[PDB]
Amino acid sequence: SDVELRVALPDGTTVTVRVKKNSTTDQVYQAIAAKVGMDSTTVNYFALFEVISHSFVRKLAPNEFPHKLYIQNYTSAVPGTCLTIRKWLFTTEEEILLNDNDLAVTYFFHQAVDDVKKGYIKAEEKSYQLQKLYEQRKMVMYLNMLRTCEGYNEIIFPHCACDSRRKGHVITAISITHFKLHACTEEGQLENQVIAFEWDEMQRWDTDEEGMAFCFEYARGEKKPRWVKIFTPYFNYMHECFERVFCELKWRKEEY
C-alpha cells in the first residue's frame, strides 16, 4: 500500500519515509537509517522510540508496527510526531570510538544537550564550562566532558509500584554499571534511599504480561535468591534493557 511516516531525529529535525503499511520497527528503522546516511557501523547505535511524555520515551519492540503508533498519536497540530530516533547504547567507550564519525557525533551531541536540559545527566557543577563548549560547537570536547557525568547512558523509567515496598514507589535506573532503584512517594517525589544491584547478582528476569510487571530474581551477599516485581507498564522495554546490558557486558573490550 505504501504510506508516509514522519520520525524526529536527535538534531531536532524530522525525516519522512515511504514504507509498507505493515512494516515492523526494524524495517522502518532501516529505511530511516539509509535515508539519513547512517553507515554499517553507525546504524547499530540507534533505534526507534515512542515519545510517551515530556520526560519519557520508550523503545519500540521488534513486533510493533510504527505506522500504527504514528496514526494513533497523530493530530493536525502536535509538534511533529511520536516516533523518534535515539541512541541505544549503554557502554560509553564504544561511542568514544565514534568521535571521528560526523553523523554519530552530531546525533550524540544533540541528544546529550537535550538530556542535560531534561535533568537526566547531572552536569550542574560544570554547567558553565559545558555551556561554553556548547556555544563554540566543540561537539567532541563537549561529549568527552559530559560522558564523565552521572547519568550518562542511564535509562530512567517513570515511577511505579513495587511489590517489595510496603508504601511508596520506585524509579528504576538502568546503566552498564548497575541496576538502581530510587525510593519515592506514590506521587513521584524522591525520598532519599537508593538500592544498587550489581549485574553479577542478577539470576534471572522475566515479564508478566497479565500482571503488567517486570520481574528479576537477585542473590545478594549470602541470602537465598529472591524475586522482585516492578509494576511498570513498560515491562517489555525494561526486559529489553536487561538483555542489552548483558550483551554489552559480554563483549566489553576494555578494562576501564
Partner: peptide, 4 residues
Amino acid sequence: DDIF
C-alpha cells in the same frame, strides 16, 4: 520484607 521490604528491600527498602
